[PDB]
Design a protein that fits this description.
The structure is cut from a larger assembly and holds chains A, B, C and D. Chain A is α+β, with helices and mostly antiparallel strands. Chain A is built from 2 helices and 6 strands; from the N terminus they run E-E-E-E-H-E-E-H. Chain A is elongated and about 65 Å long. In chain C, 18% of the residues lie in helices and 25% in strands. Classes of the chains: A alpha+beta, B alpha+beta, C alpha/beta, D mainly beta. Chain B binds one RNA strand through strand 6 and helix 5. Chain B: It comes from Leishmania donovani.
Amino acid sequence: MTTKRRNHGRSKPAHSRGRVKPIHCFNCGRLTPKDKAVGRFVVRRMLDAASARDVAEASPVYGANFPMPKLYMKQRFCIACAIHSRTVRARPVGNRKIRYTKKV
Amino acid sequence: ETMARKEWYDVVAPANFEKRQFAKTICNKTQGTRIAADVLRGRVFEANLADLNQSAGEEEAYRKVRFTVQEVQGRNLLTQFHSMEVTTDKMASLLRKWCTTMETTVEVKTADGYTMRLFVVAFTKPQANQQSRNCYAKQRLVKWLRMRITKMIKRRLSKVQIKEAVSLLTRNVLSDALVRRCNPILPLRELRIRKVRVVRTPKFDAQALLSAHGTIPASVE
Amino acid sequence: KAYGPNVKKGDLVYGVVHIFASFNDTFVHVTDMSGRETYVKVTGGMKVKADRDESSPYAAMMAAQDVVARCKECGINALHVKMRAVGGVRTKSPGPGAQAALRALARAGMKIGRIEDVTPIPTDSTRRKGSRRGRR
Amino acid sequence: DQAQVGLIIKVLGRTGSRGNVTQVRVRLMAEAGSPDYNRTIVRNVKGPCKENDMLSLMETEREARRLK
RNA sequence: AGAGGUGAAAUUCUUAGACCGCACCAAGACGAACUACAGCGAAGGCAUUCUUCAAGGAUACCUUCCUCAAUCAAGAACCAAAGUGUGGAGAUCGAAGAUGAUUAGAGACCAUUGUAGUCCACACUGCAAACGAUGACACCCAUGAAUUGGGGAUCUCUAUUCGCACGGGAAUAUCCUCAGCACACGCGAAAGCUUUGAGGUUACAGUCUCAGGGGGGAGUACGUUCGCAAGAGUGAAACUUAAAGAAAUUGACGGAAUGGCACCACAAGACGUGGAGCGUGCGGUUUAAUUUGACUCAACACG
């Protein structure tokens, strides 16, 4: 019926590609096209802050001017698996169009 | 229990490294027809370069070096270079969206007989003035990196012996030169050597190993 | 009684710990440089009586202590660490019983150094278990 | 003995569905010439709590709410 | 000495050593991150590197040619996934199948499996939400920041960083320009469209072509052409029906979210109401009559 988006939920305009190999969903397995799926890049700490003080204490080399490693992963979510996880939520019609991009 | 029949050993490193004997391990008693040594050969042993050298407070805690046991002398374990790595988390933090990453592989056969793969990774840079939202490289400049990065690693490591070759890799002399020459093509952010693993070992020759370790340190045990 | 290397007392013998923690369980596993040999293999389910809490973080804490019970016996003071997600195609996010292992180690008196992420990463993967629709 | 008597530094908030338990940051009560703080381990308390409560912890060194 | 897997389990694997940890070896698939409102392709589709073979667009040009063109019944080629044929391959996943759970029932959804298949060569099929649900060629059309090719100027804008060797180079900055994918008028039932039109249309005319004529029946029936088959193209009527449908609005509802608030709500939890003793009220059965209202909260010690 009504078009809900000028974009149809894709990064793909008409007269661009046409296919866009699909990817698996973190948490689900749903195949969705790499445009559709909601990506997030993460940079996560290995250890909770109060767990760092313990381990960062217990190490000869680590924890002074040198820090711990982190977990770096992209996450590509099915649009269902993304809403349920709340990484994205519905938004009022006026606000549907907002692009955060990366700025600072 | 099991720690009873076990024995201890320390793992020597080639003399070009600083800390020589970096590890403590185990093997069963000779135990009849079985022989402790024959099982101890081929065991890879790992390290972190900042642990192994006394160098690098500054940039290398991030390279893992690993060795294989090619001989067993006394209570020691004598090794040879097996591979060099870049740690999982160091390599995952180099990536950036909006830049191009440019990877190569180079196979060199050293003067010493070993043929080693070399995995290089170069990242494009935004310029000072750069008003644009992209670092992306034209693909004819990408392909004219890979030819240099090959021609240099072929030319420099092929006329060298592993003893001098490993020191080029662990002291990042290559990486310094591979940037110097490959910088004028594309502005490069970092160009690193991700993995070195040594594919073919020429032979086993005792003298070649012994003169690789120099003066071997004591291992009570 | 303890079986050590011959080492001037108080100096520390490094050994490696492979912490592989899925969402269904946790392994706390001590090996040596290579890893051709083990000292302690304890799973978060060896200390727990049910499959529900098999993976719980208070399970790993009780497992990682019994690794220090054994290491002090095997003469291993300090540990390098390798931490692992359930695997390459399935899930890259570490399980809840990770971090409850390390603390139960540092807080048990072990040294620590040079943690890494060993979780195997598919440059290119075979198909994941879920159907094209997903797990639903 | 098992009594390790800490202070509530603060009520780190209400936590949980019914209104009952409350997240709290605990300052281990015991003081020694080598003062052993945690310094702080978050806890969940059962029943009403207040700014200077003495909270003796029978199960020490558990990392609290984290997960849920 | 457990492992797996789940909401919790169990089917399944384990002292004949699984799970786990190192280094390898074998096979088949696959090309992560970089990866974008990016590029290329007529569409379908296309992601490692190196070599290699024919092409394709864009741009540059005071080359050549001189109407050779636009769109198209019939006709031809290509067409994702599944399918089909003969050989190969057989790692992962997995229609059918088997097993354990779930359930009032439940081969379903979930879990351990598993055949065809998924992959490749050579043939067929031509049946997509094959979508931008938007035919093709041409013209006119305002604005802001961007982006991918190529070119030009700076050598009023001229400037930055890198330094025989695939290099009198590479990228950037300012400005222009052609060509590509995109983020004011007017029109529209509205949603919305806009130099990437759904604009320039009752003030109706630039050209060609395809399809539609209330909803069903029905893409069915018969006929016929094509196909190994599955099926594809072409395609009615009898009969039935007063609406079906589109956009938008205000309510209502949600096992959607988001702030809140309630002891007729819960917590923590005090006192007994539930089923005998007995006060009536109601229902019932009874009898001439058991007069009668009011049946969730807002009916029943109430009239």
